């Protein structure tokens, strides 16, 4: 995790990643999806 105020796209620069955890799922996993979050504010009625 790094703070950035850079490119909307990934900024040019070098950073390294470190291992957090190991989970033995053991699944033949073909695909993935990203879950996004919604935000409703004061202003918004929460309507979907």
């Amino acid at each position, epitope marked *: 995790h790094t703070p950035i105020n850079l490119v909307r796209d990934l900024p*040019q620069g070098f950073s390294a990643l470190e291992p957090l955890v190991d989970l033995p799922i053991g699944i033949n996993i073909t695909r993935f999806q990203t879950l996004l979050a919604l935000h409703r504010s004061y202003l918004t009625p929460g309507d979907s």
Partner: antibody, heavy 124, light 108 residues
């Protein structure tokens, strides 16, 4: 005639607050991002703040962050910028301009329409 | 963030000549650059978007090109109307930034 008229400039002492407003016409106001850019005479043009079409997402330059809040009333067709803790440095001419969608990304068009400007002076 | 630096800061050219103002970003903006024209005390007008697309109603004399980090706005045949300060801006990433501004003046 796409138009943007700014109002609210004036003389303000340090620490004071003002709110400028920009009334828009000639386009579907609700559908576009609006920004406020300022030109401080000795210095150049600077981008102050931006608001998403929905009105929720709001971005600001670091200098202004606690001090300024940008908001809009679509029914009103008005955009506002409330300023606080004015400093001498904030003196500038503030222009409301209609921005492009950030989503366009690498193909960003930039600010298509601009208002005449409101002059705010911060001095004792 | 990214800093845009225009050059030259000021220039004087005769009418009809070709003027070329350059803008250099600190890092790759990609195509995300636009140009603005500003007259004294008047608000800026958008000349070019996406580095080379002419905004509606802008005179054809103005053109903009760019590749990599460096971009250029050329004015094929300078006219007296053209007197102004020209600014480049990069919408590529936040915060949005404008160049210092290049003042153009009619040489007589």
């Amino acid at each position: 005639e796409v138009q943007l008229v700014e109002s609210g400039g004036g003389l303000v002492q340090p620490g004071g607050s003002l709110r400028l407003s920009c009334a828009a016409s000639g386009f579907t106001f609700s559908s576009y991002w609006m920004n406020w850019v300022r030109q401080a005479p000795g210095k150049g043009l600077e981008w102050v703040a931006n608001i998403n079409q929905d009105g929720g997402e709001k971005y600001y330059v670091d200098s202004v962050r606690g001090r300024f809040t940008i908001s809009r009333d679509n029914a009103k067709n008005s955009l506002y910028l409330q300023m606080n803790s004015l400093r001498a440095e904030d003196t500038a001419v503030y222009y409301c301009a209609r921005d492009p969608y950030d989503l366009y990304g690498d193909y960003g068009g930039t600010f298509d329409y601009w208002g005449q400007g409101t002059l705010v002076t911060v001095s004792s | 963030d990214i800093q845009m630096t225009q050059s030259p800061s000021t220039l004087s050219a005769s009418v009809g000549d070709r003027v070329t103002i350059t803008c250099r970003a600190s890092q790759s903006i990609s195509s995300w650059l636009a140009w603005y024209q500003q007259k004294p005390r008047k608000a800026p007008k958008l000349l070019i978007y996406k580095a080379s697309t002419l905004e509606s109603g802008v005179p054809s004399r103005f053109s903009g090109s760019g590749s990599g980090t460096e971009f250029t706005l050329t004015i094929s045949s300078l006219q007296p109307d053209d007197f102004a300060t020209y600014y480049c801006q990069q919408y590529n990433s936040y915060s949005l930034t404008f160049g210092g501004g290049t003042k153009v003046e009619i040489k007589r």
